[PDB]
Design a protein around this ligand. Sequence first.
Ligand code: 9IK
Length: 294
Amino acid sequence: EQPDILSVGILVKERWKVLRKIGGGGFGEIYDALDMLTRENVALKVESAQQPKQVLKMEVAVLKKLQGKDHVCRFIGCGRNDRFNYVVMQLQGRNLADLRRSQSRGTFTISTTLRLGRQILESIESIHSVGFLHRDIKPSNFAMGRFPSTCRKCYMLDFGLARQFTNSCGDVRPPRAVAGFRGTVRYASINAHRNREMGRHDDLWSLFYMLVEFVVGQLPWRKIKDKEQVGSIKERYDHRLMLKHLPPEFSIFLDHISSLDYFTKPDYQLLTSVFDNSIKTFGVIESDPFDWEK
Ligand SMILES: c1ccc(Oc2ccc(Nc3ncnc4[nH]ccc34)cc2)cc1
């Protein structure tokens, strides 16, 4: 088949020494590199300069817009040449998709679920606040940090499928009649399935599906491969059934996101209160071990 975009061992811009490929899903590849200026390991994302769909221009735009914010990697560099385009950013640790799969039955406790969920909601409100939709909320786009000071922090890792949803000084942009969905079938909202323009609420639907999968270990459409068959299930599904294993205030969360549409700003403070109230009811404190620690 095709070789890796980068040969391990090469130096990018006389600074970043490529050490090992660490991922290859999506629209490119990701490497662990040594930054010889700062003398630290970093993540290096690359795409071929010839591939049909290139997303690192969006990655750089959103990463830069989010600098200073929580739950995002530090921006380190970027470039474009005849062979490849690249973006350099902070290296993180264990990926939530991997951590969930390491559990018995693929479930997290409500303690771990609520704390991760609240951090993920923070990260969604943050990207929305700078005028972008994520459009690809799924567990493999989040990781815990890899140091003592960062390993209790969850980071939003990738922005390739993002879209700017505001124009002028933060007016919502008129939606397109048709928008071809390129995200993940499992966590996609009904609107993605319908090839509708996605909104802020579609990222909150994907978070709702991730939280349910965290507590239950599976979604009702786990075994269905056909995208249209998944969409049909979601269109008809009584999402109240998913409240069974969530804390009671998730009825407020689900009622709220069900009420939303492309043109309606979410009540983020309401959704945050669901997590805050649930965490207090269950006596969860931030220092409690996550499931992978104990
Ligand atoms: C399912 C699918 C893919 C998968 O492998 C990943 C490898 C690296 C990443 N990305 C990152 N990792 C570590 N530090 C990072 N800073 C920026 C991005 C980044 C994400 C996933 C894990 C489970």
